[PDB]
Amino acid sequence: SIGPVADLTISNGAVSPDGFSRQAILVNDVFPSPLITGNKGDRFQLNVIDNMTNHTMLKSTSIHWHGFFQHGTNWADGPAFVNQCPISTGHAFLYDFQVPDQAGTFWYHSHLSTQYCDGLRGPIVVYDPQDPHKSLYDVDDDSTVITLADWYHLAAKVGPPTADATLINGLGRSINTLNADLAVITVTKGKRYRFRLVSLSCDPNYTFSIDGHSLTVIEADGVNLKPQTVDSIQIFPAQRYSFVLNADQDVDNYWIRALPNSGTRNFDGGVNSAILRYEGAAPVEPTTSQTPSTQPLVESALTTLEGTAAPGNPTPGGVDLALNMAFGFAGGRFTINGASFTPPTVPVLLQILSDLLPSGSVYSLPANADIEISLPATSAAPGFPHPFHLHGHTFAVVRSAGSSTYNYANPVYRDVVNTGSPDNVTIRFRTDNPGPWFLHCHIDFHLDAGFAVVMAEDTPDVAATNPVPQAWSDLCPTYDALS
Ligand SMILES: *[C@@H]1O[C@H](CO)[C@@H](O)[C@H](O)[C@H]1NC(C)=O
Ligand SMILES: *[C@@H]1O[C@H](CO)[C@@H](O)[C@H](O)[C@H]1NC(C)=O
Ligand SMILES: [Cu+2]
Ligand SMILES: [Cu+2]
Ligand SMILES: [Cu+2]
Ligand SMILES: [Cu+2]
């Protein structure tokens, strides 16, 4: 793997992760993008070298480092026209930030239009030398990262959508390439694995299970939690989980299954599937049967390892500022409280540094306060369920999707939450991270359609807390000169 100091060169190339050839986005000449790695407290210097020539997938790029807090380095966070102008082709831009107090499973991806759907997306693992669950597993390496990804034969900016295939570790089969190579995951009988599940999906959620094995979940979106055995896991776009697998079954091949909520909802011919292979097992497809899932993961039954409480007082409205976000759908555009987000000419953070634009979308947040955000599900926002995600913060899921109850005493903490179907998912966080932070649904087409708002956190202090490198100031004129 690479990092925490590395070059990321972005280019275009042919790929065939399902046997069908299409042009896509490469990171250091490989599809899918390589895993980045660091220890807790490393300083990260990821030099992003834009060498793209393909206009249909945009020649420009910017990278968000999903989950990282970016305290004092809001300029480094990624979202085009919120925190930076995009890097232009022929140029490079250094992302220089630290991760002092985060550790766990994360990822990086394009935050420009729909560009990460064309293959610029990759796992990040920040190991903890003192990890609290270390004693529960023997192996925790590059071989135990598992990524889930949707794959489309025609580019993001080519059709509307429906995945042609599911990619586990970059490999999978579509309905017309049932013979294509599958992803193989190799364990040794009697060893224990910390598997790091990473959804790179642009849209589908996956119900993930492994034939013949139970999963003990110990981490969600970077947050250590109390161990919790399950036999399947619903993972929504941009979410992460660590589960320990006790490789204690017979030496054999076992189907790994990852079934999307949309499109091809079967396992016929090994679509939506990969292979757990015990060492010594033959190089064949598994022939194992799947059991009905009798202990699925339940977000409202998850709790933080330390049992941390929700910020604020343990009662609704028991907070410094309650904001309710009302979803809708106008032209071809999503709306929250009546605003559709259109990317502004001057990125928000630059406006601050210079009411913010785009009007109707920007929410001033005071510092050192408790915030409660409501996001009731509604049929007025088609394409639900929507997984909303808050940059620059972990939040406490005081009430999950599918539930009516309210947990303030020890709710799970996360950075991406399913908001459910027409449900009133509510979250809490403390404002200790001054800057403009994107709040948006992570189904990436809905995002390009404007399904987003920006939290302008402690705006009087953003100028002081986030000094900006010369290279970042150079970004916008360069971009604006391009036709
Ligand atoms: C650029 O990528 C698009 C999207 O996959 C593809 O349709 C097009 O052929 C590519 N351009 C070239 C010159 O290969
Ligand atoms: C969701 O919860 C907030 C919290 O008070 C409330 O104001 C809002 O009306 C609720 N919406 C629905 C649809 O239940
Ligand atoms: Cu993300
Ligand atoms: Cu993010
Ligand atoms: Cu959505
Ligand atoms: Cu985002």
Residue numbers in the entry: 1 to 160, 163 to 356, 363 to 430, 432 to 492
Which passages does the manuscript contain on this structure?
Besides, peroxidases are sensitive to inactivation by hydrogen peroxide whereas laccases only require oxygen from the air to oxidize the arylamine, releasing water as the only by-product. Laccase oxidizes aniline monomers, dimers and oligomers.
To sum up, even though SDBS was the anionic surfactant producing the strongest loss of enzyme activity, it endowed the best performance as doping template for the enzymatic synthesis of green PANI. Hence, 5 mM SDBS as template was fixed for the next polymerization assay with increasing amounts of 7D5 laccase and 15mM of aniline. In all cases, polymerization slowed down from roughly 8–12 h onwards, most probably due to the inactivation of the enzyme. By using a first-class laccase and SDBS as template, we developed an environmentally-friendly method to produce water-soluble conductive PANI with excellent electrochemical properties in up to 75% conversion yield.
